[PDB]
From a paper:
Protein arginine methyltransferases (PRMTs) act on their substrates to yield three different forms of methylated arginine: asymmetric dimethylarginine (ADMA), symmetric dimethylarginine (SDMA), and monomethylarginine (MMA), which are the terminal products of Type I, II and III PRMTs, respectively. Among the important Type I PRMTs is CARM1 (PRMT4), which regulates multiple aspects of transcription by methylating diverse targets including RNAPII, SRC3, C/EBPβ, PAX3/7, SOX2/9, RUNX1, Notch1, p300, CBP, p/CIP, Med12, and BAF155. The requirement of CARM1 is implicated in multiple cancers, with its methyltransferase activity particularly addicted by hematopoietic malignancies and metastatic breast cancer. Mechanistically, CARM1 methylates Arg1064 of BAF155 and thus facilitates the recruitment of the BAF155-containing SWI/SNF complex to a specific subset of gene loci that are essential for breast cancer metastasis.
Upon developing cofactor-competitive PMT inhibitors, we tailored the SAM analog sinefungin around its 6′-amino moiety to potentially engage CARM1’s substrate-binding pocket. 6′-homosinefungin (HSF, i.e., 1), a sinefungin analog with the insertion of 6′−methylene moiety, was discovered for its general high affinity to Type I PRMTs (Supplementary file 1-Table A). Given the tight CARM1 binding by 1, we solved the X-ray structure of CARM1 in complex with 1 (HSF) with a resolution of 2.00 Å. However, the CARM1–1 complex is distinct for multiple configurations of its ligand and interactions via its 6′-methyleneamine moiety. In the CARM1–1 complex, 1 can adopt four alternative configurations (Configuration I in Chains B, D; Configuration II in Chain C; Configuration III and IV in Chain A) accompanied with the structural accommodation of the adjacent residues and water hydrogen bonds (Supplementary file 1-Table B–D). The desired hydrogen-bond networks of the 6′-methyleneamine moiety of 1 with CARM1, which are present in the CARM1-1 complex but absent from the CARM1–SNF and CARM1–SAH complexes, can rationalize the significant decrease of IC50 from SNF and SAH to 1. Another key difference among CARM1–1, CARM1–SNF and CARM1–SAH complexes lies in the region around the carboxylate moiety of these ligands. In Chains A and C of the CARM1–1 complex, the carboxylate moiety of the ligand forms an ionic bond with Arg169 and a hydrogen bond with Gln160 (Supplementary file 1-Table B). In addition, 1 adopts the canonical pose with its α-amino carboxylate moiety interacting with Arg168, which is similar to that of SNF and SAH but different from the noncanonical pose of 2a and 5a, upon binding CARM1.
Numbering used by the authors:
A (entry chain A): 143 to 476
B (entry chain B): 144 to 477
Write the structure that this text describes.
Amino acid sequence: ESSAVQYFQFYGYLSQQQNMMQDYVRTGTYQRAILQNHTDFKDKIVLDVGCGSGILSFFAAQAGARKIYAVEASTMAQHAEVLVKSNNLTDRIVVIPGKVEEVSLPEQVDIIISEPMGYMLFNERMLESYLHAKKYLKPSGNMFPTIGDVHLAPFTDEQLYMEQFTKANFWYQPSFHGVDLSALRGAAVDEYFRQPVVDTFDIRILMAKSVKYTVNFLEAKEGDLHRIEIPFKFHMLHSGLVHGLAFWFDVAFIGSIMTVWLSTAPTEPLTHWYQVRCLFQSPLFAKAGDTLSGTCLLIANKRQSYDISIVAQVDQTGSKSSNLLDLKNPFFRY
Amino acid sequence: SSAVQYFQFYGYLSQQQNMMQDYVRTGTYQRAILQNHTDFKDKIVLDVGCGSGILSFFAAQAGARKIYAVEASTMAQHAEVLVKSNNLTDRIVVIPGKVEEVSLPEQVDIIISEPMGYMLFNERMLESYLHAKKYLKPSGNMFPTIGDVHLAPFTDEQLYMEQFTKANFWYQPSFHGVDLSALRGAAVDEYFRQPVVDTFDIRILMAKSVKYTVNFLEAKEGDLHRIEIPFKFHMLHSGLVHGLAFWFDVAFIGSIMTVWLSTAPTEPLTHWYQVRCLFQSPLFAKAGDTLSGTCLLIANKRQSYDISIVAQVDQTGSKSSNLLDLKNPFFRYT
Ligand SMILES: NC[C@@H](CC[C@H](N)C(=O)O)C[C@H]1O[C@@H](n2cnc3c(N)ncnc32)[C@H](O)[C@@H]1O
Ligand SMILES: NC[C@@H](CC[C@H](N)C(=O)O)C[C@H]1O[C@@H](n2cnc3c(N)ncnc32)[C@H](O)[C@@H]1O
């Protein structure tokens, strides 16, 4: 409820915009996607969903768009309008303060642009507002990004596991200043392992080819994203302990001229999204040739995020791990 | 509304652990309670905001007959588990709820609490601690008994320049084609509004500190809604005053012994560090000059304070006026 207030306050700070804008892979790929697909913009009507500082709307204008509606719900809207004026684009970019679910637009649009992707793609639940915005999209219209692929792969990383395990085991102490805390170990492990780990890693820690789950933004309905079910079956390529699942995502800007990809894969140049790892509370032993199967379930919550459920098992042994994660509250290990 | 987020934060075992592991903090509380055993032996105790229960366990180690441990977060349930597993059900009673809303079955001899935040007053929990005196027997004691806030002018060219280094990101005429320069002034203002949390060498301090004292035995809840701290500094060192540094001490004034808990820069580091409020316009002062003004802390709806600092060099008449948001500190400690 009031969780939404804090969400939009976060985006009101220029300090946050600076960090975002300094992701050169993010900013550069968006610009390339838009400019190299200029025919998708030339003399067209554009909607920018959550424009922030206005940067994507400026790209749209660079690509020759006739009119851009730049919708922003935080007080960043005021700073956007300052930039539109100072950059002499008042005749083309129209900042509209407010939520995209609530504002009126005078016109339907040829193309929607946005950066709705959060950590693990889904965090922030902005994909829903992005899909909601399709009420303004003409029949023959496009969305940038067009689709999104989430990848997941099993990883081995004892150092990470043991760091999180060691923190939780503070609550295994039997005489902390003479007090037995040990009755709370189970609660601590639950809590610490509930946090997804945001950082990057060497790809050599991945034990199988990634499973991918695609969302088509042209086709999906807002309601589809309330419950996201991702089944998986990994064919294990290396033997060892599986400490959890690594997550990343790519998005594609499928234009009339080119498809441009923005990847957050660990094989690609680093972005501010990094990668996301969900640890198992207890690792699963797998041998090469084994199959690790189960289900990643994402359930939309009232905190602009998802409750994550990961159930995984080594088919050959019946060894099973069940995990609950709180995507809203990641551990930023970088 | 932001009270809900406040209590959610303390519902995490990791946040409780953060404070428990502050050795200076937790060890000093234990030593103040145990070394003043006669203030506790066979006595009735109220622990305001018991969290994990750790201070209530210390009161039990010191021989208290009965300890009412009040906790408003869901941490109350975990504290209860610890009381059971430590076989202290007969002596420690966990009462879930806000100290302003629950009922106690009897009046107490002594109130213990750790309600300090940054610059002493952040989080406004001292209002709850003072509110709790409605449960205190006449001539009952409080641990801590008094609190001192210290302020002193500092010089720190590196810290000051940093603000411009960061804000100057906006001072560029073609960021991917966009003139960002019109936002530089707003970016500067933003950074100066955040109090800086980290530690420093005492050599940066330009004058003897002044102190503002709260006597918890005497103070009323309402006294903390507006805190006016006048200051006159007779300058020890010539230089540019880049702002005011803040720290605090509390004293536990027991029957046997007074024990001090200090967060001073001359003392070992605690989880509170120290806090510096910068001046966007610095003040030049020579040794022997007097730097006078007022630091006014005005309580706000976000469990924090709006900080207004006005300072002048009496000899030159040159002044600096500053507004900071204590709810949004910059954590600089690296
Ligand atoms: N993480 C990227 C960020 C900026 C991207 C931008 N393109 C930048 O680079 O500046 C998303 C933006 O979307 C806004 N936002 C989120 N939801 C909504 C909404 N429902 N209605 C309007 N704005 C929203 C939110 O306040 C934020 O400023
Ligand atoms: N300062 C940190 C901590 C000390 C923990 C422990 N004592 C430690 O020293 O380790 C304060 C505790 O007070 C609770 N709290 C804050 N306000 C209230 C209130 N009005 N009513 C009940 N609980 C409150 C709050 O949820 C938190 O658990």
